[PDB]
């Protein structure tokens, strides 16, 4: 998941927004 | 904006900028 996608490889600050209320 | 390279708790910080007042789950696996 994205925890280990932006850790791991990269991700954007709109692939974050899908873990916000 | 830019890709992002974050670990640990410059996740939850990036979390907590782009989230803001709205909230956010943290679920690692
Ligand atoms: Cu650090």
Redesign the interface.
């Known amino acids: ?1 994205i ?2 996608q ?2 791991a490889s ?5 692939q ?2 899908n ?3 | 904006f830019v890709n992002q390279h974050l670990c640990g708790s410059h996740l939850v910080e990036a979390l907590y900028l782009v989230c803001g007042e709205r909230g956010f789950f943290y679920t690692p696996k």
């Open positions: 998941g925890v280990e932006c850790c990269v991700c954007s600050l709109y974050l927004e873990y916000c209320n």
